[PDB]
């Protein structure tokens, strides 16, 4: 009934094992993985871009005093400069501005364009793989969606494979992930109000819908210049622009252990870690009887092409006897090798022809045809390659 | 051959076509193109050949004020100065022959051509072929106004070069332009207008076929009985960013302007520092100049050479052997430092 | 878009060839700007009178012929009577659609 | 050398004989899926055709 | 600092949209994946950004700006390497047999 | 109260009125606006990229 | 929301700002003011206030 | 990929090979996209070096 096994964590290795009954005729169930987004659901802190300084211009109250007030801004800076006689290019109203002050409050505010200028300050929550099971269960060949933990119930059309437990305890993204939207730069930003002066996140922002926040940009105005009653304003250098200066590369391209990144639902684009188990409780589609299936026999497996090798390559020829033709199993009686085909069709007394791929030297492989296994050969001189994309080693 | 200017220019007069950078972040059907650069005259004779006749009045001949650009919406025969080859710079105005402008121009990677005379208010189409020459001679300058050298090099041809170049057109004009459409329901009421216009439709010999007058075309209306002005009256260039939907694989050949020959040039003559030659020592106080190849070569010895394309007032360390040092730098003559008491 | 300025109607007599024009948007009504007239009767089917200002409507009543006159495009309806109680319209079949307004009341 | 460029063949009748012109820089590609939506209609009758 | 708080509120332009820009994807040079090694001899272009990742493995992260063609150390082994150089798909660095 | 378009991306700001917007009216700054290009290649691929 | 130009243009009789580099180094209320710059670009179609 | 790309023992010859990588590309979508990006200057290599 229930075939519980393992499988790889890279894509493309379509596992094929004959689950048969004790006398119930063998049925070749198999499956390969399809894209498996690990999806770190993390807890976001501050999402502000380093905004613009909403600064108030200097009231040079000439002939009078000046009364600066409370800021009400996170860059609330009130520069009073008494003795401000800003005789400009038309003139101050009080020319002797000795009893005249040049004061002004200010407030560094966020970007209004922070609907692209933002980052989830993701503290490390959980995650789980994203499975599209390209199964060939007998000849039911489908792809099934799932979450990639060992807790889902993998129900697909009669076949319940709970996708296996956590075979790979990696995370692509660390415990502090500055997810500046299209890029989780793996950067521990400070607290919501953990602000460094002009640092990555100096524009403190509490909630992205919320208004208040911290702020550490050095909003230092000056009491103004000689005749031009200057706004002496000087903030810190822009941490939106500084964080853009420290805008990193594709961190998934640097996330080792075979990592690919994945945006907003921030998943593992080819998160090449671990091995995917599969508890395939199969339904009863393949149980043939003691006169039920094709009556195969005489498994004369010969590796008629040589196993070096690359992708599969071991040229299996199993001249096999039968009551009639069939689709015999190819399910491996060599667990070191990767035999390419699963339900191999058969005219009777003829050669089951496949490729099987593994690094055998002066063993060969026993091969699992529809009834039993037979010892195809190997090669004792190595292969002839230098570079290829990827395969079944 | 190609040795006659007038008809070989004005047979297939220029066609403003789809340049992929005409505007801010998109291209258009730009009036002036920039096809291919002929640059082998070593004084930087960049002869850009594009979709306008380089120096041609629109009625054909060398109109001094007329730069001839043409579209099926008609010939913009406009002023000469409204083209600017903004090669990271202003216009590097040398001349223009045939379908090309040949410019000695300053360095810059993001080159542009701008068109303003009767083809548009302006049109700017750029090319990345960065005009940094690295000329002849060892030195680090391009020195015309002093006669520091007359360096032998490529004089890119500015004469009446009729037949070394061949402006071609094979698979004659293929591009999308169907602007002669008119309004109808089922028998389409089109007029005369747009271009060399045929129809490509599901009915009619003018609804799917040549419209050359006013028509009510049947079996193909607006909505799915299209039309098209194909490039005719010339074998226009190759049109790049164009189609071979003009499938008339044929021949149109014409001249191209001024291939290069031999010629002298102005150059930076050799600036030497003061060589501290002493009784067992050689040093050189090379002053700073343009960043010049100093070549302190082994003079007859094992020639492990001091090379440098250097712009620093440094020391040229002259270890003078019995063989002597071969010290020549920056397009000045050499020096045979025989070192003896 | 652009509206032919409306004369007060297409006031017709028995034989009163109502040159119901609309003061066209750029100039005289044409055929590629499509500015022609219609004699539109009631019951929700507006019937073309002179389409594109150079020829009649296709199969209309005995009056309809298009014209472009003055600064306007419209239709002359000659052989018109009082059973055409409708709008006298001048509007454009202007190569992005046939679009008339109501015009005047003919 | 210098590379001349031919017009991308406006594939009416769908396909066509993409033909190797006997040049060492004579390389052709019959770019299929070829729905060139130019402004004057397809030489290609269908879009995929 | 006019002492009368009396203001005018007008709009601002330019709502941001993802414009599709003509990216940098040029032809890469000859892959000298040695019989026990890897290298990629690349050409020059506009100032490029190549990427090495320790692909499959311990993450040796590398990258670069580009102004002259160079042979990059492809981590040659069956255990893969992670390449991705200037606006194209990567290279899974695997030596064959 | 704005003007929106590209420029040579750099550090030397200036804006000019001409037809009575100055004899030449060039109000400037040290206007640091860097290139910061999307993509590893440091060019701006205008007409085909 | 500012989708009509009319009143927002009908209000603004503007003034020249104090500019300490218009010419050589000359400074005065230049009639075209340069208030700020704005980064609205992936590439930098910059929008100066 | 280097100097000696257009190979010709007939160097004044019309019978002459190449060794160059004229990389033609798939077409750009709605307008003509001519993806011929060849290999770089072998003359540009030999004179650039």
Structural method: cryo-EM
Contact A105, A71 (CB under 8 A): yes
Angle at A42 between CA A40 and CA A46, to 5 degrees: 140
Query: Coil, strand or helix: which one is B201?
Result: coil
Contact A136, A16 (CB under 8 A): yes
Query: Coil, strand or helix: which one is B7?
Result: helix
Strand-pairing partners, residue A119, are: A180
Sign of CA dihedral G34, G35, G36, G38: negative
| A176-180 vs A183-185, strand pairing mode | antiparallel
Measuring CA to CA, how many Å separate A292 from each of A23, A286, A295, B295? 11, 10, 8, 91
Closest CA to B175 of B33, B1, B319, B322: B33
Q: In chain G, which residues have their Cβ closer than 8 Å to the Cβ of E16?
A: 40
Contact B75, B97 (CB under 8 A): no
Does B213 reach chain E within 8 Å, measured CB to CB? no
Query: Coil, strand or helix: which one is H48?
Result: helix
Which residues neighbour F36 within 8 Å (Cβ) at sequence distance 6 or greater?
A244, F9, G44
In this complex, do B182 and C32 lie within 8 Å of one another by their Cβ atoms? Answer: yes
Nearest-Cα distance to chain F for H8, in Å, is 32
**Nearest residue of chain C to residue B184 (CA atoms):** C95
Cα–Cα distance measured from residue A196 to residue A190, given in angstroms and rounded to the nearest whole number: 8
Phi, psi of B114 (to 5 degrees): -120, 140
Chains A and C touch (3+ CB pairs under 8 A): no
Cα–Cα distance measured from residue A84 to residue A227, given in angstroms and rounded to the nearest whole number: 9
Burial group, residue B331, by CB count within 10 angstroms (0-12, 13-18, 19+): buried
Measuring CA to CA, how many Å separate B10 from each of A144, B234, C7? 67, 9, 53
Cα–Cα distance measured from residue C18 to residue C12, given in angstroms and rounded to the nearest whole number: 5
> Resolution to 1 decimal, in Å?
6.3
Alpha helices per DSSP H over chain C: none
Give the dihedral of Cα atoms A128, A132, A133, A134; nearest 10 deg: -160
Q: Which subunits sit against F, judged by 3+ Cβ pairs under 8 A?
A: B, E, G, H
Sign of CA dihedral B67, B71, B73, B74: positive
Q: How far is CA A214 from the centre of its chain?
A: 31
Nearest-Cα distance to chain G for B31, in Å, is 24
Chains G and H touch (3+ CB pairs under 8 A): no
Phi, psi of A58 (to 5 degrees): -75, 115
Cα–Cα distance measured from residue A169 to residue A147, given in angstroms and rounded to the nearest whole number: 15
In this complex, do F49 and E23 lie within 8 Å of one another by their Cβ atoms? Answer: yes
Q: What is the largest CA-CA distance in chain H?
A: 43
Burial group, residue A166, by CB count within 10 angstroms (0-12, 13-18, 19+): middle
Cα–Cα distance measured from residue B83 to residue B92, given in angstroms and rounded to the nearest whole number: 11
Strand-pairing partners, residue B200, are: B226
Half-sphere exposure for D48 (CA within 13 Å, toward CB): 0
Neighbouring C-beta atoms of residue A267, cutoff 10 Å: 21
Instruction: Specify the residue for token string 């009556």.
Output: A295
| B292-298 vs A27-32, strand pairing mode | unpaired
Contact G44, F3 (CB under 8 A): no
Burial group, residue B279, by CB count within 10 angstroms (0-12, 13-18, 19+): exposed
Strand-pairing partners, residue A162, are: A279
Structure tokens of B57? Answer: 């009045």
Q: What is the DSSP string of B229-263?
A: E---SS--S--TT--B-S-----EEEEES---EEE
Q: In chain B, which residues have their Cβ closer than 8 Å to the Cβ of H31?
A: 18, 20, 27, 176, 241
Cα–Cα distance measured from residue C45 to residue A254, given in angstroms and rounded to the nearest whole number: 70
**Nearest residue of chain E to residue H35 (CA atoms):** E26
Cα–Cα distance measured from residue B150 to residue A236, given in angstroms and rounded to the nearest whole number: 56
Sign of CA dihedral A192, A193, A195, A198: positive
Structure tokens of B194? Answer: 């747009």
Closest CA to A135 of A292, A17, A266: A17
Half-sphere exposure for A131 (CA within 13 Å, toward CB): 32
Closest CA to A141 of A30, A301, A296: A30
Considering only the beta carbons, identify the residue of B20, B25, B128 that sits closest to E19: B25
The 3-state secondary structure of chain A reads CEEEECCCCCCCCCEEEEECCCCCCCEEEEEECCCCCCCCCCECCCCCCCCCEECCCCEEEECCCCCCCCCCCCCCCCECCECCCCCCCCCCCCCCHHHEEEEECCEECCCCCCCCCCEEEEECCCCCCEEEEEEEECCEEEEEEEECCCCCCCEECCEEEEECCCCCCCCCCCCEEEEECCEEECCCCCCCCCCCCCCCCCECCCCCCCCCCCECCCCCCCCCCCCCCCCCCCCCCCHHHHHHHCCCCCCCCCCCCCCCCCCCCCCCCCCCCCCCCEEEECCCCCCCCCCCCCCEEEEEEEEEECCCCCCCCEEEEEEEEECCCEEEECCCCCCCCCECCCEEEECCCEEEEEEECCCCCCCCEEEECCCCEEEECCCCCCCCCCCECCCCC
Cα–Cα distance measured from residue C24 to residue C35, given in angstroms and rounded to the nearest whole number: 7
Sign of CA dihedral C63, C65, C68, C74: positive
Q: Would you call the peptide bond into A309 cis, given omega within 30 degrees of 0 as the criterion?
A: yes
Which residues neighbour A147 within 8 Å (Cβ) at sequence distance 6 or greater?
A128, A129, A130, A131, A163
Does B179 reach chain C within 8 Å, measured CB to CB? no
**Nearest residue of chain B to residue D11 (CA atoms):** B245
Query: Coil, strand or helix: which one is B84?
Result: strand
Instruction: Specify the residue for token string 């899974």.
Output: E92
Cα–Cα distance measured from residue A51 to residue A106, given in angstroms and rounded to the nearest whole number: 13
Measuring CA to CA, how many Å separate A235 from each of A50, A107, A118, A216, A222? 11, 10, 20, 10, 11
Percentage helix, strand, coil for chain C under 3-state DSSP, each rounded to 5:
0, 40, 60
Contact B14, B51 (CB under 8 A): yes
Closest CA to B99 of B253, B306, B294: B253
Closest CA to A239 of A118, A360, A86: A118
In this complex, do A228 and G29 lie within 8 Å of one another by their Cβ atoms? Answer: no
Burial group, residue A6, by CB count within 10 angstroms (0-12, 13-18, 19+): middle
Cα–Cα distance measured from residue A389 to residue A383, given in angstroms and rounded to the nearest whole number: 16
The 3-state secondary structure of A269-302 reads CCCCCCCCCEEEECCCCCCCCCCCCCCEEEEEEE
Q: In chain H, which residues have their Cβ closer than 8 Å to the Cβ of F43?
A: none
Instruction: Specify the residue for token string 């799932």.
Output: A146
Contact B91, B100 (CB under 8 A): no
Query: Coil, strand or helix: which one is G10?
Result: helix
Structure tokens of A374? Answer: 């037979």
Which residues neighbour F41 within 8 Å (Cβ) at sequence distance 6 or greater?
E23, E24, E25, E26, E45, E46, E47, E48, E49, E66, E86, E87
Half-sphere exposure for B191 (CA within 13 Å, toward CB): 12
In this complex, do D10 and B245 lie within 8 Å of one another by their Cβ atoms? Answer: yes
Cα–Cα distance measured from residue B230 to residue B212, given in angstroms and rounded to the nearest whole number: 13
Cα–Cα distance measured from residue B6 to residue B10, given in angstroms and rounded to the nearest whole number: 6
Which residues neighbour A143 within 8 Å (Cβ) at sequence distance 6 or greater?
A34, A132, A133, A134, A135
Chains F and E touch (3+ CB pairs under 8 A): yes
Cα–Cα distance measured from residue A208 to residue A211, given in angstroms and rounded to the nearest whole number: 8
Cα–Cα distance measured from residue B34 to residue B21, given in angstroms and rounded to the nearest whole number: 11
Q: In chain G, what is the straight-line distance between the N-terminal and C-terminal CA atoms, in Å?
A: 18
Cα–Cα distance measured from residue E12 to residue A316, given in angstroms and rounded to the nearest whole number: 72
Cα–Cα distance measured from residue B209 to residue A187, given in angstroms and rounded to the nearest whole number: 65
Structure tokens of B200? Answer: 């490509």
Which residues neighbour B311 within 8 Å (Cβ) at sequence distance 6 or greater?
B140, B288, B289, B290, B291, B292
Q: In chain C, which residues have their Cβ closer than 8 Å to the Cβ of B189?
A: 31, 52, 93
Angle at B155 between CA B151 and CA B158, to 5 degrees: 150
Cα–Cα distance measured from residue H38 to residue H17, given in angstroms and rounded to the nearest whole number: 16
Q: In chain H, which residues have their Cβ closer than 8 Å to the Cβ of D48?
A: none
Q: How far is CA B331 from the centre of its chain?
A: 29
Measuring CA to CA, how many Å separate B332 from each of A108, A137, B141, B270, B285? 62, 83, 13, 4, 16
Structure tokens of G47? Answer: 């929008």
Neighbouring C-beta atoms of residue A25, cutoff 10 Å: 19
Closest CA to G33 of A155, A165, C14, F16: F16
Closest CA to H32 of B69, D18, B17, B99: B17
Measuring CA to CA, how many Å separate C61 from each of A91, B62, D26? 81, 61, 67
| B252-256 vs B124-128, strand pairing mode | unpaired
């Amino acid at each position: 009934y229930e075939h519980t096994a393992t499988i790889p964590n890279v894509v493309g290795f379509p596992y094929k094992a004959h689950i048969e009954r004790n006398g119930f005729s063998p049925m070749t169930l198999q499956l390969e993985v399809v894209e498996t987004s690990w999806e770190p659901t993390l807890n976001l802190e501050y999402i502000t871009c380093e905004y613009k300084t909403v600064v108030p211009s200097p009231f040079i109250k000439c002939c009078g005093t000046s009364e600066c007030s409370s800021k009400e801004q996170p860059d609330y800076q009130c520069k009073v400069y008494t003795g401000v006689y800003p005789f400009m290019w038309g003139g101050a109203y009080c020319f002797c501005d000795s009893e005249n002050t040049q004061l002004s409050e200010a407030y560094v505010d966020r970007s209004d364009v922070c609907k692209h200028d933002h980052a989830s300050a993701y503290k490390a929550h959980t995650a789980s793989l994203k499975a599209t099971i390209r199964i060939s269960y007998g000849t039911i060949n489908q792809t099934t969606e799932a979450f990639v933990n060992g807790e889902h119930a993998v129900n697909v059309g009669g076949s319940k494979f709970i996708f296996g437990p956590i075979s790979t305890a990696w995370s692509p993204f660390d415990n502090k992930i500055v997810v500046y939207k299209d890029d989780v730069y793996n950067q521990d930003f400070p607290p919501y109000g953990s602000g460094q002066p002009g640092r990555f996140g100096d524009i403190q922002s509490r909630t992205v819908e919320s208004k208040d926040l911290y702020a550490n940009t050095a909003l230092k105005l000056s009491r103004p210049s000689p005749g031009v009653v200057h706004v002496p304003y000087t903030p810190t250098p822009s941490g939106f622009k500084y964080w853009l200066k420290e805008k990193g590369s594709s961190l998934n391209t640097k996330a080792p252990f075979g990592c690919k990144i994945k945006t907003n639902p921030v998943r593992a684009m080819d998160c090449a870690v671990g091995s995917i188990p599969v508890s395939m409780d199969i339904p009863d589609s393949a149980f043939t009887r003691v006169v039920d299936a094709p009556a195969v026999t005489d498994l004369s497996c010969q590796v008629v092409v040589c196993t070096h090798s690359s992708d599969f390559g071991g040229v299996a020829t199993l001249s096999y006897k039968t009551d009639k033709p069939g689709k015999c199993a190819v399910h491996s009686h060599s667990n070191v090798a990767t035999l390419q085909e699963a339900t191999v069709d058969v005219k009777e007394d003829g050669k089951v022809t496949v490729h099987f791929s593994t690094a055998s030297a002066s063993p060969a492989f026993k091969v699992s045809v529809c009834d039993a296994k037979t010892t195809c050969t190997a090669a004792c001189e190595p292969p002839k390659d230098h570079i290829v994309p990827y395969g079944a080693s | 051959s190609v040795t006659e200017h007038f008809n070989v220019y004005k047979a297939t007069r220029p066609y403003l076509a789809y340049c992929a950078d005409c505007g801010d972040g998109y291209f258009c059907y730009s009036p002036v193109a920039i096809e291919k650069i002929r640059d082998e005259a070593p004084d930087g004779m960049l002869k850009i050949q594009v979709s306008a006749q380089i120096g041609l009045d629109k009625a054909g001949t060398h109109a001094h004020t007329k730069i001839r650009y043409m579209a099926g919406h008609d010939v913009q025969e406009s002023k000469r100065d409204s083209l600017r080859v903004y090669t990271s710079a202003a216009c590097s105005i040398h001349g223009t022959m045939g379908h090309f402008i040949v410019a000695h121009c300053p360095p810059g990677d993001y080159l542009k051509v701008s068109f303003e005379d009767a083809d548009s208010h302006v049109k700017a189409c750029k090319v990345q072929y960065k005009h940094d020459p690295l000329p002849v001679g060892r030195e680090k300058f391009v020195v015309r106004p002093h006669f520091g050298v007359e360096l032998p090099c490529t004089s890119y041809q500015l004469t009446t070069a009729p037949t070394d170049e061949e402006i071609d057109m094979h698979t004659p004009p293929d591009i999308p332009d169907r602007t002669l459409l008119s309004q109808t329901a089922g028998n389409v009421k089109i007029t005369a207008g747009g271009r060399t216009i045929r129809y490509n439709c599901t009915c009619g010999r003018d609804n799917v076929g040549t419209t050359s007058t006013d028509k009510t075309i049947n079996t193909c209306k607006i909505d799915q009985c299209h039309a098209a002005v194909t490039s005719h009256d010339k074998w226009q260039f190759t049109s790049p960013f164009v189609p071979r939907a003009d499938q008339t694989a044929r021949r149109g050949k014409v001249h191209v302007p001024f291939p290069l020959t031999n010629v002298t040039c102005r150059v930076p003559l050799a600036r030497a520092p003061d060589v501290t030659y002493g009784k067992k020592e050689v040093t050189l106080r090379l002053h700073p100049d343009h960043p010049t190849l100093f070549s302190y070569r082994s003079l007859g010895a094992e020639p492990h050479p001091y090379e440098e394309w250097v712009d620093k007032f440094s020391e040229r360390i002259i270890p003078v052997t019995e063989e002597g040092i071969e010290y020549q730098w920056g397009n000045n003559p050499p020096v045979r430092l025989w070192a003896q008491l | 878009q652009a509206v032919v300025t409306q004369e007060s109607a297409l006031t017709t007599s028995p034989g009163e060839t109502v040159t119901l024009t609309c003061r066209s948007n750029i100039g005289a009504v044409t055929s590629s700007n499509c500015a022609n007239w219609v004699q539109e009767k009631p019951d929700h089917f507006f019937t073309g009178l002179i389409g594109d200002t150079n020829n009649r409507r296709s199969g209309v009543p005995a009056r309809f012929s298009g014209s472009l006159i003055g600064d306007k495009a419209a239709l002359t309806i000659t052989g018109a009577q009082t059973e055409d109680e409708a709008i006298y319209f001048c509007a454009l079949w202007y190569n992005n659609l046939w679009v008339f307004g109501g015009g005047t009341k003919l």
